[PDB]
Amino acid sequence: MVPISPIETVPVKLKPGMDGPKVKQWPLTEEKIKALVEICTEMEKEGKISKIGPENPYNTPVFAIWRKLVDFRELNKRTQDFWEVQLGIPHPAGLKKKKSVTVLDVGDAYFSVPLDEDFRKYTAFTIPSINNETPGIRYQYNVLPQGWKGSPAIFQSSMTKILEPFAAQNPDIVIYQYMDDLYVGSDLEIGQHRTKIEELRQHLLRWGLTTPDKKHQKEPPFLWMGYELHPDKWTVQPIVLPEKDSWTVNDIQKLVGKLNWASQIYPGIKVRQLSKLLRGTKALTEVIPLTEEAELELAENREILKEPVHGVYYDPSKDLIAEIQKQGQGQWTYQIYQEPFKNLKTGKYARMRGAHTNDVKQLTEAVQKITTESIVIWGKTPKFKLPIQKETWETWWTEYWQATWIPEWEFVNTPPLVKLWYQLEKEPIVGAETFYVDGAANRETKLGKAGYVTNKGRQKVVPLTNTTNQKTELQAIYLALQDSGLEVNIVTDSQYALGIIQAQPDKSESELVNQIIEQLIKKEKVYLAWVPAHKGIGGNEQVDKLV
Amino acid sequence: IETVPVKLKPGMDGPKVKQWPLTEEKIKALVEICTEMEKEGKISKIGPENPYNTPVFAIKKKDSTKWRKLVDFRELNKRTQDFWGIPHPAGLKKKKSVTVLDVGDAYFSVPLDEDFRKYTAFTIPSINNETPGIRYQYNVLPQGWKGSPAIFQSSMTKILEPFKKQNPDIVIYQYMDDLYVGSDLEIGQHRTKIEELRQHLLRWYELHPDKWTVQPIVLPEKDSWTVNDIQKLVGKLNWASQIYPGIKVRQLSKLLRGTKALTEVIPLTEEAELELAENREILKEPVHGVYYDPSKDLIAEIQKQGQGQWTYQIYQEPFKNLKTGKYARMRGAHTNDVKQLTEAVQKITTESIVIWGKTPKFKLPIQKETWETWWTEYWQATWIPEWEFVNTPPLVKLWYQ
Ligand SMILES: COC(=O)Cc1cc(Oc2ccccc2OCCn2ccc(=O)[nH]c2=O)c(C)c2cc(C#N)ccc12
């Protein structure tokens, strides 16, 4: 017999203070009992388990469905935490084309790696006897049980330690471990590649690990994690948008899942309205009628998902490009590619939940997201193509009160373009009228007044119902903007209004703020000055609006 | 050569902090560095039975192209038991000059407590999660850990004992992996003495605190004032009244009586000039009842002023500034606001270390996503402070300008 190399065991303990499981065994039918006796007999013959004496006080319930199924949920609750290196799957757009690619599934994955002997006593389970007239047969696991908390991590670490020397002495091939399957790839000739595969399954056989002896049962295209991997391209598995008489919550969520999953390769997928119908529903059966906006979004989605679209694999010798387009209503779409009309992948970004916003901030956020995603997938930041002029970005970041930065980028002239819609003056305007504004509201009656007095003697006070102090301050500024010329100086005491305007929004939830923005867009020069309230600053008349 | 037992705070498990993505060149640099450290026994590979993790990344310090490994031990530091204390040198900030030295290598000659090693675990990530990340743990005192200077304190005292006995006028301080050396000599004599101390440390950053002080509130001096000028003056004086008690603005607000054009020149009455003069005299005095409490956190606020200029204030209680400053240095960051903000955070943190011996909590005028995306690209220090993000534009920006 050729001596097998031992597999180093992983020391495992339970959580601090917790003890091993003690769960009562279920009563099973005579047929099920016989089945489990045969199965456990063959397994004991193979060495996966071993009979134990009555000294062991731990027990784990067992079932037959014949196939044996041990329910380790309690032991999993009591087992220590492990390091799971599987946190996010590799994205197909990050792969590099290989001339030859082979799949080698390892049979009896967890049942070939030994378990820490000091921990095996916690995996004990019993087989009930016929008519329960004899003591049930006691067993413990000698290898990694499928369903136990630590089996995937220990299996992957053992496989990695086994594969390290082979990969070191073979720098011309790439190996991926995934569950009980291995994915090898190389650019060598098909004969040399198959030869190195034989060497690999030999090296795995030296440790007692088996691979597909026949022709590898999986060949391109590979269907994996909702993806199709082809010899020269990749895509998602077919996305079919169904016809429906009426759409429900689960139908709409299925559709938004298909659209979100399909948006990584199909450019221009929008989900704002269809996901907007889910605003605080929380009822899986509640049928929601589609707005015509959502139906139109659906029509565009079907028009995009009409015929298949594929992505290419990554070439490290070419530059990495990411281009962004604005779609409206806080929606953004982007393509990552290395050659024109051949995308590596696509995606979208929706603006965050906020009371006020502008296009420049959203474009910045989308750039940050694309940057992080690109560092994840390809390990580098791409060059950007953005629908914003260089001068616009320069003015924005130089005048913005916050710090901001975009990595290397260039302007692409693809409307709609992101622009600055208004800019406030830094100094007061000579020759422009000076509007002293103020507003106030009664906290009980919700009655208020908003208005202005100007240096030319122009005055206005408007009364208001169902309002607040903030609303009357914004309303006063809006009145000054409505009744003034193309150049105006405005004096307010509202720290609230100044806080809003100094954030430079071009769009807002409050209709009053949006009207103020529309007024600012029409002005040539606006200087907004702030003064403290109730300080006897003449002109600023708190008493004119408190009547 | 003998390990000291180290434990964690009661009821606290080890750190389990996600490792953030790194570029390919940083991953390769960390692979080379960690390989070399593994050949030297400073680190060892670990198995899946270690669930703890601490973030790691790679930087490049000043005047060097060699990649350096930086571990973000913030979570482990706050989860590590408190080590006890040496009173902070109150004369280090008073000295004419201070030079900062990197003594981190000396930590790697002292072994680390065995049972604690599983808490220093870190992961070199892989691109696209293709292969599992390379997991390590430390066998010696790691750089960036707070327990490393505390444990190495005795050895460091024994190494610096001859030099301290030779020059009693030189103040020596230690924070994390850095050694702060304050003296009053000449820049040439200072550099030669620094070479003397570095070879003394071998066989076993010019910073002048005297050129930084506290900044007073100043008011304009004009021969003619506009309505806008007086309005801004009243704004700044009303703001300063939160800091100084006797500030009054009624005689200056009396000038603003009426709805006048903002650019119209208003002459100051005699009462207004007297009030402004009294406010100047009040602002020339220090703030009333401003003390430092070692049991409280230090808070630092930074305002972007434009044209590469930045202002900052370190305080504990609002309107009780312990330090104020204005960082306007330009060093290859003309077109990058985030690099400027990051260098500013590093300088402010260094000053805080020199004055109080601990780092402040920052309020950064930046969106979270931008900062967290880019700040590691410009970081050169061995420590990392804590920070939060201010999303509302503060009105007091120009009142510090
Ligand atoms: C785990 O790594 C991955 O997720 C990527 C991954 C890579 C992989 O194959 C590879 C193995 C080693 C290096 C690169 C590989 O793909 C390069 C790109 N590609 C892909 C398919 C093809 O024909 N031709 C190609 O040039 C296979 C065969 C996978 C198979 C399955 C299945 N079933 C799942 C993922 C797979």
mmCIF file with all atom_site columns, N, CA and C in Angstrom, chain A residues 96-102 171-174 184-194 196 231 314-316:
data_model
loop_
_atom_site.group_PDB
_atom_site.id
_atom_site.type_symbol
_atom_site.label_atom_id
_atom_site.label_alt_id
_atom_site.label_comp_id
_atom_site.label_asym_id
_atom_site.label_entity_id
_atom_site.label_seq_id
_atom_site.pdbx_PDB_ins_code
_atom_site.Cartn_x
_atom_site.Cartn_y
_atom_site.Cartn_z
_atom_site.occupancy
_atom_site.B_iso_or_equiv
_atom_site.pdbx_formal_charge
_atom_site.auth_seq_id
_atom_site.auth_comp_id
_atom_site.auth_asym_id
_atom_site.auth_atom_id
_atom_site.pdbx_PDB_model_num
ATOM 1  N N  . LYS A 1 96  ? -9.934  36.235 -16.002 1.00 0.00 ? 96  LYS A N  1
ATOM 2  C CA . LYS A 1 96  ? -9.055  36.441 -17.143 1.00 0.00 ? 96  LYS A CA 1
ATOM 3  C C  . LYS A 1 96  ? -9.134  35.231 -18.060 1.00 0.00 ? 96  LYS A C  1
ATOM 4  N N  . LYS A 1 97  ? -9.350  35.484 -19.353 1.00 0.00 ? 97  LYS A N  1
ATOM 5  C CA . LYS A 1 97  ? -9.552  34.411 -20.321 1.00 0.00 ? 97  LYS A CA 1
ATOM 6  C C  . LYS A 1 97  ? -8.388  33.427 -20.308 1.00 0.00 ? 97  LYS A C  1
ATOM 7  N N  . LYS A 1 98  ? -8.717  32.142 -20.226 1.00 0.00 ? 98  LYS A N  1
ATOM 8  C CA . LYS A 1 98  ? -7.739  31.065 -20.283 1.00 0.00 ? 98  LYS A CA 1
ATOM 9  C C  . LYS A 1 98  ? -8.046  30.170 -21.476 1.00 0.00 ? 98  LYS A C  1
ATOM 10 N N  . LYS A 1 99  ? -6.991  29.696 -22.144 1.00 0.00 ? 99  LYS A N  1
ATOM 11 C CA . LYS A 1 99  ? -7.189  28.848 -23.315 1.00 0.00 ? 99  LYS A CA 1
ATOM 12 C C  . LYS A 1 99  ? -7.833  27.517 -22.947 1.00 0.00 ? 99  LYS A C  1
ATOM 13 N N  . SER A 1 100 ? -7.509  26.971 -21.778 1.00 0.00 ? 100 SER A N  1
ATOM 14 C CA . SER A 1 100 ? -8.084  25.716 -21.315 1.00 0.00 ? 100 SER A CA 1
ATOM 15 C C  . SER A 1 100 ? -8.559  25.864 -19.878 1.00 0.00 ? 100 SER A C  1
ATOM 16 N N  . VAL A 1 101 ? -9.693  25.237 -19.579 1.00 0.00 ? 101 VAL A N  1
ATOM 17 C CA . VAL A 1 101 ? -10.359 25.366 -18.287 1.00 0.00 ? 101 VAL A CA 1
ATOM 18 C C  . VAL A 1 101 ? -10.995 24.027 -17.939 1.00 0.00 ? 101 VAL A C  1
ATOM 19 N N  . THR A 1 102 ? -10.747 23.554 -16.719 1.00 0.00 ? 102 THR A N  1
ATOM 20 C CA . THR A 1 102 ? -11.143 22.225 -16.284 1.00 0.00 ? 102 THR A CA 1
ATOM 21 C C  . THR A 1 102 ? -11.805 22.297 -14.915 1.00 0.00 ? 102 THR A C  1
ATOM 22 N N  . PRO A 1 171 ? 3.454   27.934 -11.467 1.00 0.00 ? 171 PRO A N  1
ATOM 23 C CA . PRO A 1 171 ? 2.982   29.319 -11.596 1.00 0.00 ? 171 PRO A CA 1
ATOM 24 C C  . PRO A 1 171 ? 2.263   29.610 -12.904 1.00 0.00 ? 171 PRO A C  1
ATOM 25 N N  . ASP A 1 172 ? 2.177   28.647 -13.818 1.00 0.00 ? 172 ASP A N  1
ATOM 26 C CA . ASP A 1 172 ? 1.549   28.856 -15.115 1.00 0.00 ? 172 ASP A CA 1
ATOM 27 C C  . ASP A 1 172 ? 0.090   28.424 -15.150 1.00 0.00 ? 172 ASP A C  1
ATOM 28 N N  . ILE A 1 173 ? -0.473  27.983 -14.025 1.00 0.00 ? 173 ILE A N  1
ATOM 29 C CA . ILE A 1 173 ? -1.882  27.623 -13.960 1.00 0.00 ? 173 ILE A CA 1
ATOM 30 C C  . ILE A 1 173 ? -2.513  28.337 -12.773 1.00 0.00 ? 173 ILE A C  1
ATOM 31 N N  . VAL A 1 174 ? -3.832  28.496 -12.844 1.00 0.00 ? 174 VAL A N  1
ATOM 32 C CA . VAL A 1 174 ? -4.616  29.123 -11.789 1.00 0.00 ? 174 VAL A CA 1
ATOM 33 C C  . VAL A 1 174 ? -5.621  28.105 -11.272 1.00 0.00 ? 174 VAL A C  1
ATOM 34 N N  . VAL A 1 184 ? -9.606  24.777 -12.525 1.00 0.00 ? 184 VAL A N  1
ATOM 35 C CA . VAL A 1 184 ? -8.239  25.027 -12.963 1.00 0.00 ? 184 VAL A CA 1
ATOM 36 C C  . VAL A 1 184 ? -8.281  25.652 -14.349 1.00 0.00 ? 184 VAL A C  1
ATOM 37 N N  . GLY A 1 185 ? -7.331  26.534 -14.616 1.00 0.00 ? 185 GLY A N  1
ATOM 38 C CA . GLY A 1 185 ? -7.272  27.195 -15.907 1.00 0.00 ? 185 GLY A CA 1
ATOM 39 C C  . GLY A 1 185 ? -5.844  27.509 -16.275 1.00 0.00 ? 185 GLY A C  1
ATOM 40 N N  . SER A 1 186 ? -5.561  27.468 -17.575 1.00 0.00 ? 186 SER A N  1
ATOM 41 C CA . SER A 1 186 ? -4.211  27.736 -18.048 1.00 0.00 ? 186 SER A CA 1
ATOM 42 C C  . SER A 1 186 ? -4.266  28.143 -19.513 1.00 0.00 ? 186 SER A C  1
ATOM 43 N N  . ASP A 1 187 ? -3.197  28.800 -19.963 1.00 0.00 ? 187 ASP A N  1
ATOM 44 C CA . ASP A 1 187 ? -3.044  29.188 -21.358 1.00 0.00 ? 187 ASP A CA 1
ATOM 45 C C  . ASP A 1 187 ? -2.122  28.251 -22.129 1.00 0.00 ? 187 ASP A C  1
ATOM 46 N N  . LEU A 1 188 ? -1.685  27.157 -21.511 1.00 0.00 ? 188 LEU A N  1
ATOM 47 C CA . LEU A 1 188 ? -0.854  26.180 -22.195 1.00 0.00 ? 188 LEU A CA 1
ATOM 48 C C  . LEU A 1 188 ? -1.656  25.471 -23.282 1.00 0.00 ? 188 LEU A C  1
ATOM 49 N N  . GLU A 1 189 ? -0.949  24.685 -24.091 1.00 0.00 ? 189 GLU A N  1
ATOM 50 C CA . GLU A 1 189 ? -1.617  23.854 -25.079 1.00 0.00 ? 189 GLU A CA 1
ATOM 51 C C  . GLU A 1 189 ? -2.496  22.820 -24.383 1.00 0.00 ? 189 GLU A C  1
ATOM 52 N N  . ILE A 1 190 ? -3.517  22.356 -25.108 1.00 0.00 ? 190 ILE A N  1
ATOM 53 C CA . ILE A 1 190 ? -4.526  21.485 -24.509 1.00 0.00 ? 190 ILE A CA 1
ATOM 54 C C  . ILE A 1 190 ? -3.889  20.204 -23.977 1.00 0.00 ? 190 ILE A C  1
ATOM 55 N N  . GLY A 1 191 ? -2.864  19.699 -24.667 1.00 0.00 ? 191 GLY A N  1
ATOM 56 C CA . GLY A 1 191 ? -2.190  18.499 -24.196 1.00 0.00 ? 191 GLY A CA 1
ATOM 57 C C  . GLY A 1 191 ? -1.430  18.730 -22.903 1.00 0.00 ? 191 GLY A C  1
ATOM 58 N N  . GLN A 1 192 ? -0.615  19.791 -22.863 1.00 0.00 ? 192 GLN A N  1
ATOM 59 C CA . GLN A 1 192 ? 0.095   20.133 -21.635 1.00 0.00 ? 192 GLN A CA 1
ATOM 60 C C  . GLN A 1 192 ? -0.869  20.478 -20.507 1.00 0.00 ? 192 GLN A C  1
ATOM 61 N N  . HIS A 1 193 ? -2.007  21.095 -20.832 1.00 0.00 ? 193 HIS A N  1
ATOM 62 C CA . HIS A 1 193 ? -2.988  21.425 -19.804 1.00 0.00 ? 193 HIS A CA 1
ATOM 63 C C  . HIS A 1 193 ? -3.596  20.165 -19.201 1.00 0.00 ? 193 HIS A C  1
ATOM 64 N N  . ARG A 1 194 ? -4.033  19.228 -20.049 1.00 0.00 ? 194 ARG A N  1
ATOM 65 C CA . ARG A 1 194 ? -4.564  17.968 -19.537 1.00 0.00 ? 194 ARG A CA 1
ATOM 66 C C  . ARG A 1 194 ? -3.504  17.207 -18.748 1.00 0.00 ? 194 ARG A C  1
ATOM 67 N N  . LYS A 1 196 ? -1.015  18.567 -16.949 1.00 0.00 ? 196 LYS A N  1
ATOM 68 C CA . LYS A 1 196 ? -0.913  19.195 -15.635 1.00 0.00 ? 196 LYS A CA 1
ATOM 69 C C  . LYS A 1 196 ? -2.145  18.922 -14.782 1.00 0.00 ? 196 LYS A C  1
ATOM 70 N N  . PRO A 1 231 ? -16.527 30.183 -22.927 1.00 0.00 ? 231 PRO A N  1
ATOM 71 C CA . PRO A 1 231 ? -15.068 30.200 -23.136 1.00 0.00 ? 231 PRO A CA 1
ATOM 72 C C  . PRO A 1 231 ? -14.479 31.588 -23.336 1.00 0.00 ? 231 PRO A C  1
ATOM 73 N N  . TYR A 1 314 ? -11.633 39.988 -18.209 1.00 0.00 ? 314 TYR A N  1
ATOM 74 C CA . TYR A 1 314 ? -10.721 41.082 -17.916 1.00 0.00 ? 314 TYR A CA 1
ATOM 75 C C  . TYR A 1 314 ? -9.361  40.851 -18.558 1.00 0.00 ? 314 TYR A C  1
ATOM 76 N N  . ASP A 1 315 ? -8.817  41.908 -19.148 1.00 0.00 ? 315 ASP A N  1
ATOM 77 C CA . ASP A 1 315 ? -7.473  41.894 -19.721 1.00 0.00 ? 315 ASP A CA 1
ATOM 78 C C  . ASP A 1 315 ? -6.611  42.899 -18.972 1.00 0.00 ? 315 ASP A C  1
ATOM 79 N N  . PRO A 1 316 ? -5.652  42.453 -18.156 1.00 0.00 ? 316 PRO A N  1
ATOM 80 C CA . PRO A 1 316 ? -4.869  43.408 -17.354 1.00 0.00 ? 316 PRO A CA 1
ATOM 81 C C  . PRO A 1 316 ? -3.990  44.330 -18.178 1.00 0.00 ? 316 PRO A C  1
#
